Amino acid sequence: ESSVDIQGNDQMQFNTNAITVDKSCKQFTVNLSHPGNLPKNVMGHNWVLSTAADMQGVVTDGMASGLDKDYLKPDDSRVIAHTKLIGSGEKDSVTFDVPKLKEGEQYMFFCTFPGHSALMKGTLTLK
Amino acid sequence: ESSVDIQGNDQMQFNTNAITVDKSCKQFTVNLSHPGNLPKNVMGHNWVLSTAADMQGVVTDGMASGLDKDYLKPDDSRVIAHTKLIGSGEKDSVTFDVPKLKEGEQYMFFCTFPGHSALMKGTLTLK
Amino acid sequence: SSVDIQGNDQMQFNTNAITVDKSCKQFTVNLSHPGNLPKNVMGHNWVLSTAADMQGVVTDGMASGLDKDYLKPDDSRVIAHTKLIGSGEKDSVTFDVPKLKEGEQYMFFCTFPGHSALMKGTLTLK
Amino acid sequence: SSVDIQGNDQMQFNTNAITVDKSCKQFTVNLSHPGNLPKNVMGHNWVLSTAADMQGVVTDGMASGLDKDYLKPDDSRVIAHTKLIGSGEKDSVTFDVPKLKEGEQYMFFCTFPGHSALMKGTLTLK
Ligand SMILES: [Cu+2]
Ligand SMILES: [Cu+2]
């Protein structure tokens, strides 16, 4: 709605595959946590938002950027918002302006750690 | 909780990847719907529950059973509960006894329509 | 100059990366479907677009129906494609290499509903 | 009598079904890793168990660490396995065919954390 708590676990999945953002809000907050036991260098997760069209490009380039850049191309203009890459027992939050999004456009959230985006992706919709 | 509403969509995903069942309840109800536009013979979804150990065997045998058996081996003793296979606009509900489950055992829910179990799977735990 | 690709009953291609040599005039893709499932349940095509266009092609294809092989007719974003095949079938497509640009990211995928989740790979001209 | 399997940077094996002829005494699996990612990020092994035992092998292997190749040592459910490899590496494993039973469902998979979601296939003796 206005804020969502998302968990990325050791089973390589987020708790949810769909987020809806209330268009009447000015900002939207994503709180990311990592239940489980594996550290970020093996089962790291971030939360990255792009249009569905741009997802593939963001993932491909992020995979090539490495752990120390949180598997994201620095200053990637396609990334609307993102957290850092976290491991078990860590947390990160990102707040972004809702006007960065528009109705009728399809958005996807995903993890860019290599391989994870096959399962760790979902839709975000403005309503 | 005691009941959960689950949606399976045209993007081949359920809305959630984790369900928690309250141990104090006698029964648990899953309500499944299918938003979207594709019919069951193309983008059919069911909700099927087994232990994690048994999932592979249920999926493999279900795939071989065909559309008219809802992609499930009839009388499969590994299936704890399941809905029927539904397509867009349809709904099904299943209620099962919570004592069919035990604490400490890992359960998985999934769709057995050919190919779907790769992303349409999640964990179910008794708390 | 050609490649043999298989799409199976487990909703996967046997390769997720193709490199096309720029000195080639034409490139051929031979698609086969090992397995037992029919086209209506586990159909696969090989469709090529830029990486940026993939999502649009997939979404418009999904809406086009089985009768049109889940591909929008005359889709300008589609550089080349096979037909949609079932188990035991095969198809081949040949396209002109100069249609591709060196330095551009291209993707191949299946447009049957849901398949593109796993049935995708990259194609690059080198 | 042998098969060649590739595990890539896109977390997939190149085949998801192997059939072993029961007239063979031994069977050899040669595993390679195309791509560029290192073992710690995109490591792959080839591990064989019955289909009913897969989940237990994967779960216990996840907890065993990179230093043990994500496999519980002396796991009695593991029929055969390679070591965990990174890109540019190769390993082979040979196993006695009579260890497998005709009519049982076997699975091969990678035990690197999360990989088994996609890196799995069936193996049957015929
Ligand atoms: Cu991740
Ligand atoms: Cu389904």
Ligand SMILES: [Cu+2]
């Ligand atoms: Cu397909």
Ligand SMILES: [Cu+2]
């Ligand atoms: Cu692996």
